[model samples]
Target chain A: DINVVNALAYEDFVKLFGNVVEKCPLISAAIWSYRPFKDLADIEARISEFIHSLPDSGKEGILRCHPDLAGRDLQSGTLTPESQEEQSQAGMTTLDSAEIVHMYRLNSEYKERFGFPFVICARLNNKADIVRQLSERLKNRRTAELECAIEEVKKICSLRLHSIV
Target chain B: DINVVNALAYEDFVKLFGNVVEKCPLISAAIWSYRPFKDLADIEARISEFIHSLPDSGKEGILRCHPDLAGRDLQSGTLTPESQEEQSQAGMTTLDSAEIVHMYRLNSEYKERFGFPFVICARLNNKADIVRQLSERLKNRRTAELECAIEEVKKICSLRLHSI
Candidate 1:
């Protein structure tokens, strides 16, 4: 685990980073070709640049892959281990009926308005913070919402990337 | 646990039957409206009738919700608890590299043919049987494949329904 990023091979790199961007393993695979990143920060920037380069539709696809907070998937215990860990950390696993309804309702509403699921960096906030952000972001116009959501995605990716390498 | 189906309220009944049809909780929710099922078999028939009643797209949606046998969801520990349990019972949890690639390759091919995942009663087959059947089913015509696959969905549902 102490090895430098440059020391790893493509397959090994993927095993670690393939899901750093949620279900988008393609991002990790694409970033692999940008190899020999100087440090952890360098690779984080490389990942950010890759994310930034995507068109809005492509970016929406990235967000689309994420399951909702306290969603049906989580209720059924089907969340990815990384997501399960993050959401559980933010107290999603312990949501009351009110919280559950609120999150799910707002999630559906947010998606209806913007055509993508509400996403936030769960690891960076507690349950309250997440709920607050979802409510706040739900009011944004399309372009603003997209920009805000992508920044959260980058924070999520940044945290995940640092945790591994 | 011997509580009768007759005894369950809407929410509790759904709590039990919600995932009997894999990811289609709506099936159980809908079935509750037809309640007072006489026995487990009666309820099983109810579930089957509901399944049979779906249009092809809705049936495809039910099939779409399933993860591939030994697919990435299982590898990443993201399969539903019911799925994880069934797949593990059939030795999917302990797949070797060759077994992994073979199942995965066949899984994609089967999907490419049918536009939905290849599903079967994992509780009914061992690892070798699953591999053989996956390969065997890959050659089936579309209508035949959907028929065979939907029947397997029912069997998987039956075992799960019985287990719960």
Candidate 2:
């Protein structure tokens, strides 16, 4: 369906896919340099490889750009539309007060353990699953969590690509 | 936050919140008769009581309107946008091919037994939880499943009230 994405002008293309990772336009812009993509698969692979090539700190920047899975950002209006919609679809918007409070605490605890917001594809999981995964991922070392985070970012990109491109 | 729903003209309010139950506008329109709802709580209670008042066939009509849990509707593109999004967020979209096939078969088995699609608040549950519940619900007598479906419909209505 996004077959036409391969032919868009370079700047337009970057702006198109840039928000796949929050605050990380550079990932898509970097892929723009490799324009005239053979297909959408090439675009996804290039953006993914670019993220993988970043230094650990740069990778952390992308991870941190992701808002907390169902954190206060939902109330604070800090989440991008895409992230907000993803969370809403996951039943985050309908959480009762008690569950909301639980999510707040879990998000804080996860940040303390891993030094970054919990990053999972909200489009692909419900609030309960996200909380369960958050608890499980808390035990992982920072390095392992970083890998997991990037992988989740990759999944996010894949989904975003289908919509944008 | 639907503090203002009570203020809408009866027709407008029903047009807004009706169809919270799939294919059921009367549910919302009927509540309009008790206009000037004290608050959202009063509105919710009115709709729920109306549902409780429906005859068995009417209750079954409401249940049949709901799509199966991650069933053919997901593939056949028959699910409403709301159902699609709810299932997607529950990670049904990410189900493995084998799991999808398993769901199809489970759904068929469930319908054969219960005479209706399995219903759950998919937004509040993942595919695994739905499958597990479907299997368990299959063991229940038809009367219990009927009540269970209506309860799930109430939860669905409760969730939709927040959005609409």
Candidate 3:
């Protein structure tokens, strides 16, 4: 069984746990201590409890960690190595290229109308579909659309969190 | 062409939005807002802005509103009325009694393993395929499984929010 205690440096902990927060808000609030070297169950107990309780600030903190849309050419390079790998591996070349163009055009139109980027769950969507979704969503009410963005983040976090311990 | 500014109420807004969201996230987020609407164009203008800003907070917020799994007799009753109607209209009862029992068993095991209910987008998945997907997702990491839940919400929302 895996020892619940983290033997790595704080940096390592940040790398692993921070990534979890980036992908899934459900796990963002999970608590941990650098104490007794217990086993997997103990770790899971802490994880469950953390998930069970909300620190009031957990939701916002969790939200801050998510990655920007890969289609946003504004980024000079990908922030996460794994995300970079995923981008290249997903065969988004043709579709993503077109999506980038569509996003750019739609983003300009959307921003000119509203005041923000077209936030949706970029992590979960395939390439061409993202653009199609963007084009369609551009026709909604401003207030209603903002709530939609949060929904995407919440889902992305859950998917990412499910990947690790 | 649509002018819902004066006519839309709270749940009415949710219903109209759910239709489009089921298609794609872009359309769903494109029109999201929280303030009193002035007109349809005003709503459309803000949809453009909201999409451009697209912070992580916005992303996560959209994800959580997804409907939970279709199991849990206690929980199933709470689903938005439309979901139930859609489920029934999709010919759910057409399966044989034995098949229904098997699907129910699989669903139960799935719920027991994952704290939340199974949530495949019914439009994209057939009943038998839904059962298969449910069985497979059960084997995933809790976080991964949960992510699937999140993605499924995006998939469903995209469809629902932009049905118009």
Candidate 4:
């Protein structure tokens, strides 16, 4: 599978991350320059660095692409399988009714507060951690949380890179 | 390694967890019933479930047992080796001075707001992420945040179980 990865053209690489993550094709497109990568980790690290170096608007777009933790996309089954697995690992798939409602409220309140959906590395944390983080981030100034959101987007992309390549 | 783990006595297990995590001896004592564990995952899942089911104070104790993320324990090098590695994985060891100060401020504010230092599975996230969450969780009601804090404690214990 990794052998096939190195042979893929730049556009193909861009398509891979773009299709999987939904925003920041620019990151993948930029990351294409770093191919043929030695391994998946190289690709992931390169993409993470690329995202980190991006302009504010570019990072914001990347942050905007993520589904909320246990939010509408989860219930609608609209999340990509990669996202589905990440959320499931965080116990979002098994949330009790009160928990679900709490998350829904958090999702709305978070967007209203920060102008973007809450983003965290769900693969690395469970539902409780996610909810706790969600509540905590509500206190941040927009600029600070936006930067934080971008960092989380990079973490999500890093995990997705491992899954794909 | 697996066999050695399964053969440990209940108090031995308690001392192991108590010394490493610095709290939650009761969790280990309670989890001893599930032995001989089929494997590490089995033991961790059992411990995590037990922690989640604890009364509020017990779970709070679990939360309190953890040093603040990037707090005095980290700087003083007093955190257990296991905790050091977990924080290191989260990039806590490499935080710049300003970032460290921000975390320190957040830690104090968080304790003031919620009556406990922030509790997260640091191994699962990075310094930037930890700070952001610390800033965000500040607005939550005390009761809601307390429940959330306990949940994070379970995740932390789950990871610690894997290591030991």
Top candidate by TM-score = 1
**TM-score for the B chain of model 1:** 0.95
Candidate 3: stretches off by over 4 Å: A1-165, B2-15, B18-79
Q: Which stretches of candidate 1 lie over 4 Å from their true place?
A: A1-165, B1-3
User: For each model in turn, which proportion of the native inter-chain contacts is also found?
Assistant: 0.00, 0.00, 0.00, 0.00
Q: A86-133 in candidate 4: lDDT tens per residue?
A: 899999999889989988898888876765578888888977788789
Number of residue pairs clashing in candidate 3, backbone atoms closer than 3 angstroms, sequence gap of 3 or more or interchain: 79
Q: For candidate 2, lDDT tens digit of each residue in B8-119?
A: 6443564577567764554665566566778777878977887776545456646655666666668788777778877888888788889888888988888678656678
Q: Supply candidate 3's per-residue lDDT for A43.
A: 42
Best by lDDT: 1
Per-model TM against the reference:
0.52, 0.49, 0.36, 0.46
On DockQ, the candidate that comes out on top is 1
Model 1, range B1-164, lDDT digits (tens) per residue?
A: 43577777444565677678775555665565455667788778877886676545445545666788998889999888899999999999998999898888898788777767789899989998988898898898887887888899999899988888
Answer with 1 or 4, whichever has the higher lDDT. Answer: 1
lDDT score of residue B23 within candidate 3: 20
Chain B TM-score against the true chain B, each candidate: 0.95, 0.91, 0.58, 0.84
CAPRI-style class, candidate 1: incorrect
Tens digit of lDDT per residue, candidate 2, span A4-105?
665654335545775776655545644655656787788778777766655464565456556666675787877787888888988888888898889889
